[PDB]
Amino acid sequence: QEKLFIQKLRQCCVLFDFVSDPLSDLKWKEVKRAALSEMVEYITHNRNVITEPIYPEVVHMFAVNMFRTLPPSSNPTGAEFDPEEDEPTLEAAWPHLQLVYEFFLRFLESPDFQPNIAKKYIDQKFVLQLLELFDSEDPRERDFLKTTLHRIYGKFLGLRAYIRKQINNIFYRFIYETEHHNGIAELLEILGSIINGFALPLKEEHKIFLLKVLLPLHKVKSLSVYHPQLAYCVVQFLEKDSTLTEPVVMALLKYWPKTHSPKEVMFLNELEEILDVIEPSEFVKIMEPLFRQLAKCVSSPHFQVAERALYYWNNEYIMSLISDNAAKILPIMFPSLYRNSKTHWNKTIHGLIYNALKLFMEMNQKLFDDCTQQFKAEKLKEKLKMKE
Amino acid sequence: XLXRXXX
Amino acid sequence: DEKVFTKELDQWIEQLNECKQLSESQVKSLCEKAKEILTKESNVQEVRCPVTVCGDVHGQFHDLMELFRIGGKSPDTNYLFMGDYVDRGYYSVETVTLLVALKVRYRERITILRGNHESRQITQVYGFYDECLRKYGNANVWKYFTDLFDYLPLTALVDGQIFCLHGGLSPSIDTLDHIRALDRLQEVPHEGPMCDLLWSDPDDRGGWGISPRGAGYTFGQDISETFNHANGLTLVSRAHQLVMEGYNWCHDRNVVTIFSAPNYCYRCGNQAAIMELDDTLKYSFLQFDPAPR
Amino acid sequence: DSLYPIAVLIDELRNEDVQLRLNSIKKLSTIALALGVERTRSELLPFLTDTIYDEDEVLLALAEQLGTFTTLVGGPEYVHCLLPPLESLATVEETVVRDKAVESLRAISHEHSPSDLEAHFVPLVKRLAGGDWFTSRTSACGLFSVCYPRVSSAVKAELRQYFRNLCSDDTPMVRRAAASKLGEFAKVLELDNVKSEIIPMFSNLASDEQDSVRLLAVEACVNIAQLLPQEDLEALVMPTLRQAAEDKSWRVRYMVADKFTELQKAVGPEITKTDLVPAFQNLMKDCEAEVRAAASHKVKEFCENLSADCRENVIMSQILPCIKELVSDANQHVKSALASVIMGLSPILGKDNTIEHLLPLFLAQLKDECPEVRLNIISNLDCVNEVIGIRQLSQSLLPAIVELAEDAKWRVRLAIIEYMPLLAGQLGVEFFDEKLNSLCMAWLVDHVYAIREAATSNLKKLVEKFGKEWAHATIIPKVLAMSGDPNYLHRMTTLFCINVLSEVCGQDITTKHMLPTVLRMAGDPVANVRFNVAKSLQKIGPILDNSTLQSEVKPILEKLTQDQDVDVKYFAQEALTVLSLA
Ligand SMILES: [Mn+2]
Ligand SMILES: [Mn+2]
């Protein structure tokens, strides 16, 4: 007809309380599979520009097609297992939900559909229940949720406090209470966008966000999963304000792994991603301890690390910095790069090192030799006395 | 299937 | 003089047998011994039946025990393992420490071979390494053990009739004498006969093929067949690939694979099995499931 | 002869090689020792107090140390010293450290005299709870159960107030903590207060937005229901508890399931028969596999504890209906779950019902694919015959048992082997010899060693039951026939049995029918067989008479000490030294 403001509010009600258990494989009567694909191409394919009739028959519908207590985990305990290796348990009725998301997404995403056609139809209680969801169906389930929660955040300046506060609450439980959850990765992307576009002169609750939530995440041992999305946040954060540099670098330096080679690599890697943007004036606050550590890495016995450590030498900027301050650095590295590299098996780092040194000469000859001297000298004494 | 070097 | 040690090993084992790692100071001591004892062996170890052939174990200690509840226990029953002792599993240390303890003790009741994993590089990469730290603080028990690994023989010949190796056949290797000339006293190289022996697999693509692994090759029916006929082999027993069924025949009952690590990496839901060569070399396979943990 | 070392630990506490700093702290007592109290009080604590440690491993060590300085700080008069540092370690981020910090704070609480408590301790809890950061507050929660009883009327007033706050926190994390401890805290409040104060908090935390909070409330309902006098239960506790068995979040329901019989007993014998009984079905018919099986485990204990005067009835009209259904579920864990307890119903429903009702199910399971469910059932037949007629058993169960006796999954084969000795006895030897014997002999030659060993021992259990005379005419025969089998694995088997039979065959049968074959084998190809013969004689040695010992033994147990295979060698030698034959 020409009065659909009762054709949909009756249609949605069809799709709503529908709920058909797809864990028995019976009652093959589609109905809904289509009833929605319609409610889609309807608000999408320009078949509309004025379907704002005051109605949350969508939210309700969604919040009863989506909101449920996720089922018991399908992957083992967690001690002798690595999450990266968990087989993605797929949730059936996806082909069903797949739309409720599609639609509810191709909903408030469209123009002319105000933030007050929802303001009080999408309250914290909807946010929260929505959040929990960040938990299992191989990305799919999440991915939508990721997006959804992105848009619900950058539309209602009222839930901003909440989504944030509530995203923390998950993390703290993840970090200190149970050390298990799946959406940490997804969530972090969302927090990527959010940081990148904060109040130019940073509200203080964020610095806490970073310092008391973000860094500590590097603590968990399943870091091998959200690590990258994480770094990004750590980095993005340093671009929105290079004050925080000194404490974020001092953080990683403390939380630095000690029996988990892979993490050691990751840190090293996240570290370069930071130096790369480090600010001269700041690189001086760290440096000393930073390089005090890099030193150790080079002199690790786990080629995977030592290799990632030395790769710093192939970075313009980092080298640049190292030069302007070659005075205090060269001596800290030396003993390890000049380490009497004649007791290894990896017939590769020995060369890899020569090359670093070589790259160190060309920068400040004198210093180089002068240190070589100092070392050789000391080196001599210890070989003399310590042989009584 | 975990990674070639062998599930 | 003789009861000042053989009595102690008996304990070391009793301990590991309860799943409690030996102490650092003790590992080295154990490996030192294992050394002298392993030097003396060939590269193609000739051991007479009857025996039991065991494949991959990959630190799955408990499922190792299960194996023993199947094929009997040492020294009461003769054994022969084909590498891959560490990595993947959660109790690497304990496992290897043990198997080695057994070799240093019942010197001629068990035979262990080197696998694609008794190499520093993979052990670092795939786990063992870290586990050592995670359990001993330093990384010395790692060195100590990565070095013992070098003296592990590359192959085994049961009654001159059956050939044994972790991986498989190598182009650079035509005969068994072509193997006794090699020098295994070194870290597994990236390319070459030795490397191949521990990385090579069986293919259905016929004739030598490049291995999608990264080392060794993919021999085939033809290749196998000639090998056997050549040196005088009735069966080549390797085992380096997860066979969903515990063990598998191929190349027309010529070469056989045997994975002993059940439910591999605690993920691969496969069966594992071992092969018992009797008093007159008879094929009798025993499949088993991961020990109820 | 000197005090140097110690004096250095008091220096290696700021060393900077964490690894040392650790030890120096990990021994922090023998410093307050050689330091001597009056000093320990005025120097060592104020150092541990004003020194910010980073490394967690050390931080945990110190926290644990402090809890024992009661003595070394100079006794109870002073224990209130160890507060400041713990009070800090209780704030520390990493949980484990502060967790231990609190553990101690409690332990050393019992040392403060009320005077002190009201004055120093209480305050700390006050401050901790009044914390800025959630952790502090999280910690606070665990510190009430220890001072409330001993403080003042007016202090408890305040304390109560405070604790109700940590329960109404904006942080789930704190709420969950508050919840988890709510139970142990009601247990100290005066009855009245539990009703007028606890109960309300109980209700709230039991209906939080957060399920992982709610479910921790379910656990407290059990502690409160034990403090409360029956009457009141139906008015304060009951509303809520019912609510939980219904909660949307299966995680909560799952609780009422696991902590059911624990409630049952607490609730009452009647209110059980009134609400729990129905509710209990509910869970068995739940939508979540867990909650289902979770209830299954509690069937036996539920019934056993059902009021004496209704039991056999309610089991028969309420429980038994749902049970029959469970037996045939699709979630192996629920099938295997109850498949373990179920049989404990036999002695409740008597000889009759059991055979007309339960006995059928036993067949259902006993045959079910899932090893677990068989294996979980096979393990209680040791009983049944105590209810059903021992004939009924050998008639409508033994047929299947004689099946399991040899099915694939060995752990089940075993399960039977271990249940034989009873069957054999209970059934009577002539029966055994006629229809059971072979099985018990077959096992002696199973592929899986585990199964032979089990069956080997299983003999000695039989000889104990049918006299040495029987074994001579039904066992020793075949047992020795093995000595032939080509496979050295079986061949040995013989020598094994002997080492067991002899313990129970009297010096006689042992010397005239076993000791020969033990010698006749010391000349076998496979050394394995030989060195075992050595270990064998060392076993069946003492049972022999000093005469036969230096006669046939030593002489032949010498031809081994001089054998090629080192193993054989070692075992012969250590087969004399023990026998005292050299
Ligand atoms: Mn392998
Ligand atoms: Mn391998």
The token duo for A231 is 């770094």
Burial class (CB in 10 A: 0-12, 13-18, 19+), D349: buried
Helix pair C24-39, C141-148: axis angle to 10 deg: 10
Rounded Cα distance, C228 and C232, in Å? 6
Q: Where are the alpha helices (DSSP H) in D418-448?
A: 420-427, 429-431, 437-442
The token duo for D91 is 């704030």
Quick check: helix, strand or coil at residue C283?
A: coil
Going from the C-alpha of C29 to that of each of C34, C120, C144, D254, D294, the distances in angstroms are 9, 20, 9, 52, 50
The token duo for C46 is 């000739």
Rounded Cα distance, A242 and D88, in Å? 31
Report which of A268, A269, A211, A198 is spatially closest to residue A239, judged by C-alpha positions: A198
Minimal-distance CA residue of chain B relative to C211: B4
Handedness of CA D143, D149, D155, D157 (dihedral sign): positive
Under 8 Å between Cβ of D222 and D180? no
Compute, in angstroms, the gap from residue A269 CA to the centroid of ligand 1. 30
**From the candidate CATH numbers 3.60.21.10, 3.30.428.10, 3.90.1300.10, 3.30.70.980, the one assigned to the domain spanning C1-293:** 3.60.21.10
The token duo for D257 is 């399931």
Greatest Cα-to-Cα distance within chain B, rounded to the nearest angstrom: 10
Determined by X-ray
Rounded Cα distance, D148 and A105, in Å? 54
Under 8 Å between Cβ of D313 and D283? no
C287 has which bridge partners?
C273
The DSSP symbol for D409 reads S
CB within 8 Å: A172 and D134 = yes
Ligand nearest to the CA of C268: 1
Residues of B with CB below 8 A from C242's CB? Answer: 6-7
Q: Where are the alpha helices (DSSP H) in D273-331?
A: 277-284, 289-296, 299-304, 311-314, 320-327
Ligand 2 being an ion, which residues bring their Cβ within 5 A of it? C 84, 116, 240
Give the gyration radius of chain B's Cα atoms: 4
The token duo for A52 is 């704002």
Under 8 Å between Cβ of A332 and A295? yes
Query: For position D120, which CATH number holds?
Result: 1.25.10.10
Under 8 Å between Cβ of D540 and D552? no
The token duo for A186 is 């997804």
Rounded Cα distance, D572 and D563, in Å? 9
Rounded Cα distance, D523 and A353, in Å? 65
Element of type H or E holding A60: helix A57-62
CA–centroid distance for C250 within its chain: 20
Rounded Cα distance, C27 and C292, in Å? 29
Q: What type of residue is C217?
A: Y
Minimal-distance CA residue of chain C relative to B7: C268
Quick check: helix, strand or coil at residue A324?
A: helix
Query: Tokens 């005067």 map to which residue?
Result: D309
Other beta carbons within 10 angstroms of residue A129's beta carbon come to: 14
The DSSP symbol for C53 reads E
For chain A, how far is it from start to end, CA to CA, in angstroms? 105
Other beta carbons within 10 angstroms of residue C283's beta carbon come to: 14
Rounded Cα distance, A290 and D274, in Å? 69
Element of type H or E holding A144: helix A140-153
In which domain, by residue range, is D264 found?
1-582
Annotated binding residues of C for Mn(2+): 56, 58, 84, 116, 166, 240
The DSSP symbol for D82 reads S
Q: Which residue of the set C117, C178, C190, C229 is catalytic?
A: C117
Other beta carbons within 10 angstroms of residue A122's beta carbon come to: 22
The token duo for D258 is 């696991």
Query: Tokens 């521990």 map to which residue?
Result: C198
The DSSP line for C148-217 is HGGGS-SEEEETTTEEE-SS---TT--SSHHHHTS--SS---SSSHHHHHHH-EE-SS-S--B-SSSSSB
Q: Which residues of D78-114 are buried (b: 16+ CB within 10 A; e: fewer)?
A: bbbbbbbbbbbbbbbebeebbbbbbebbeebbebbee
Pairing status of strand C245-250 against strand C271-277:
parallel
Minimal-distance CA residue of chain A relative to C146: A345
Rounded Cα distance, A189 and C64, in Å? 43
Query: Tokens 């009056």 map to which residue?
Result: D38
Rounded Cα distance, A73 and D269, in Å? 36
Q: Tell me whether C70 touches chain B (CB under 8 Å).
A: no
The token duo for D61 is 């060590």
Compute, in angstroms, the gap from residue A352 CA to the centroid of ligand 2. 29
Report which of D384, D386, D458, D444 is spatially closest to residue D415, judged by C-alpha positions: D458
Element of type H or E holding C39: helix C24-39
Compute, in angstroms, the gap from residue C84 CA to the centroid of ligand 2. 6
Rounded Cα distance, D81 and C262, in Å? 56
Calculated CA dihedral for residues A32, A37, A42, A46, nearest 10 degrees: 170
Rounded Cα distance, D376 and D379, in Å? 6
Other beta carbons within 10 angstroms of residue A322's beta carbon come to: 23
Under 8 Å between Cβ of C193 and C178? yes
Is there an interface between D and B (3+ Cβ pairs < 8 A)? no
Under 8 Å between Cβ of C26 and C144? no
C217 has which bridge partners?
C210
Going from the C-alpha of C45 to that of each of C82, C105, C116, D228, D403, the distances in angstroms are 12, 18, 18, 76, 45
Task: Kindly list the residues of chain A whose beta carbon comes within 8 Å of any beta carbon in chain C.
Answer: 76, 79-81, 85, 258-261, 301-304, 345-346
Rounded Cα distance, D104 and D28, in Å? 15
The DSSP symbol for D276 reads I
From the CA of D65, how many Å to the nearest CA of chain C? 23
Burial class (CB in 10 A: 0-12, 13-18, 19+), A360: buried
CA atoms within 13 A on the CB side of D297: 15
The token duo for D26 is 């990990």
From the CA of C48, how many Å to the nearest CA of chain B? 31
Rounded Cα distance, D450 and A297, in Å? 49
For chain C, give every domain's residue range: 1-293
Q: Which residues of D240-276 are buried (b: 16+ CB within 10 A; e: fewer)?
A: bbebbbebebbbbbbbbbbbbbbbbebbbbebbbebb
Going from the C-alpha of D497 to that of each of C74, D526, D553, the distances in angstroms are 18, 19, 19
Handedness of CA C9, C12, C15, C19 (dihedral sign): negative
Helix then strand count (H, E) for chain A reads 20, 0
Under 8 Å between Cβ of C27 and C97? yes
From the CA of D568, how many Å to the nearest CA of chain C? 11
Q: Tell me whether A77 touches chain D (CB under 8 Å).
A: no
Residues 6+ apart with CB under 8 A from A101: A66, A144, A145, A148
Rounded Cα distance, A154 and D16, in Å? 48
Report which of A163, A186, A57, A189 is spatially closest to residue A118, judged by C-alpha positions: A57
Q: Nearest 5 degrees, angle CA A354-CA A358-CA A364? A: 145
Other beta carbons within 10 angstroms of residue D137's beta carbon come to: 21
Residues for chain C: how many in total?
293
Going from the C-alpha of D423 to that of each of D365, D392, D407, D454, D504, the distances in angstroms are 19, 13, 18, 16, 20
Rounded Cα distance, D267 and D287, in Å? 25
Report which of D227, D219, D136, D135 is spatially closest to residue D190, judged by C-alpha positions: D227
Task: Kindly list the residues of chain C whose beta carbon comes within 8 Å of any beta carbon in chain A.
Answer: 89-90, 120-121, 124-125, 129-130, 133-134, 139, 143, 187, 265-267
Q: Could you say which of D173, D211, D251 has the minimum Cβ distance to residue A177?
A: D173
Going from the C-alpha of D499 to that of each of A85, A111, D453, D462, D478, the distances in angstroms are 49, 89, 12, 15, 16
| Cis peptide, bond prior to residue C262, ω within 30 of zero | no
Residues 6+ apart with CB under 8 A from A24: none
Rounded Cα distance, A301 and D485, in Å? 54
Other beta carbons within 10 angstroms of residue D219's beta carbon come to: 18
Under 8 Å between Cβ of D72 and D34? no
Q: What type of residue is D303?
A: C
Rounded Cα distance, C26 and C36, in Å? 16
For chain B, how far is it from start to end, CA to CA, in angstroms? 4
Chain A neighbours (≥3 Cβ pairs under 8 A) are: C, D
Q: Tell me whether D134 touches chain A (CB under 8 Å).
A: yes
CB within 8 Å: B5 and C125 = yes
CB within 8 Å: A69 and D249 = yes
Which of C58, C95, C120, C147 would best serve as a mutation to test chain A binding (most A beta carbons within 10 A)?
A: C120
Output helix, strand, coil percentages for chain D, rounded to the nearest 5: 75, 0, 25
C255 has which bridge partners?
C236, C250
Other beta carbons within 10 angstroms of residue A133's beta carbon come to: 20
Other beta carbons within 10 angstroms of residue D328's beta carbon come to: 11
Under 8 Å between Cβ of D203 and D214? no
Calculated CA dihedral for residues D374, D375, D377, D381, nearest 10 degrees: 120
The DSSP symbol for C79 reads E
Compute, in angstroms, the gap from residue C106 CA to the centroid of ligand 2. 26
Residues 6+ apart with CB under 8 A from D320: D357
Other beta carbons within 10 angstroms of residue A234's beta carbon come to: 22
C272 has which bridge partners?
C246, C288
Q: Tell me whether C265 touches chain B (CB under 8 Å).
A: yes
Minimal-distance CA residue of chain C relative to D574: C3
CB within 8 Å: B4 and C214 = yes
Under 8 Å between Cβ of A206 and A198? yes
The token duo for A3 is 């009065």
Helix pair D172-186, D211-227: axis angle to 10 deg: 10
Other beta carbons within 10 angstroms of residue D511's beta carbon come to: 18
Rounded Cα distance, C17 and C28, in Å? 19
Rounded Cα distance, D63 and D138, in Å? 17
Domains of chain A (ranges plus CATH)?
1-388 (1.25.10.10)
| Cis peptide, bond prior to residue C75, ω within 30 of zero | yes
Could you give phi then psi for residue A370, rounded to 5 degrees? -50, -40
Rounded Cα distance, D216 and C9, in Å? 51
How many domains does chain D fold into?
1
Handedness of CA D476, D480, D485, D487 (dihedral sign): positive
Pairing status of strand C235-237 against strand C218-219:
unpaired
Under 8 Å between Cβ of D108 and D121? no
The answer to whether C117 is a known catalytic residue is yes
Quick check: helix, strand or coil at residue C4?
A: coil
Compute, in angstroms, the gap from residue C64 CA to the centroid of ligand 1. 14
Rounded Cα distance, A144 and C49, in Å? 62
Rounded Cα distance, A263 and A269, in Å? 9
Q: Tell me whether D447 touches chain C (CB under 8 Å).
A: yes
Other beta carbons within 10 angstroms of residue A208's beta carbon come to: 13
Contacts of residues D223-230 at CB distance under 8 Å and 24 or more positions apart, as own/partner, are D223/D183, D223/D184, D223/D186, D223/D187, D224/D183, D224/D186, D224/D194, D224/D198, D224/D199, D225/D263, D225/D266, D225/D267, D226/D266, D227/D186, D227/D187, D227/D191, D227/D194, D228/D194, D228/D195, D230/D268, D230/D271
Going from the C-alpha of A358 to that of each of A198, A307, A323, A332, C196, the distances in angstroms are 44, 16, 14, 16, 37
Rounded Cα distance, D130 and D122, in Å? 12
φ/ψ bin of D25: left (φ > 0), alpha (ψ from -120 to 50), beta (otherwise): alpha
Query: Tokens 């088993």 map to which residue?
Result: C288
Rounded Cα distance, D572 and D562, in Å? 9
Q: Tell me whether C292 touches chain B (CB under 8 Å).
A: no
Rounded Cα distance, D75 and D77, in Å? 5
